Amino acid sequence: DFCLEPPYTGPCRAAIIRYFYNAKAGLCQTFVYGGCRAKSNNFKSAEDCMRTCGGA
Q1: C-alpha R_g of the chain
Q2: CA angle, residues 23, 52, 29, in degrees to nearest 5
Q3: Whether 18 contacts 44, CB under 8 Å
Q4: What is the role of the protein in this entry?
Q5: Can you list the domains of the chain with their CATH numbers?
Q6: 11 near 35, Cβ under 8 Å?
Q7: Residue 47, Cβ neighbours under 10 Å: how many?
Q8: How many Å apart are CA 23 and CA 7, to the nearest integer?
Q9: Are the C-beta atoms of 32 and 7 separated by less than 8 Å?
Q10: Contact indicator for 14, 34 with CB cutoff of 8 Å
Q11: Helix (H) and strand (E) counts for the chain?
């Protein structure tokens, strides 16, 4: 959801993108959010990706 599980790309709205953490394939990925409380996960670079689930 934020680091491995399936990121929310459109739970409320349509579909918006940015960076997520896909800690299995190559880690830092993309999905931003698609409505709701922006699903908290919402990165844009390595520093972003890291502060949330990269180096926590």
Answers
A1: 10
A2: 40
A3: yes
A4: Inhibits trypsin, kallikrein, chymotrypsin, and plasmin.
A5: 1-56 (4.10.410.10)
A6: yes
A7: 11
A8: 12
A9: no
A10: yes
A11: 1, 2
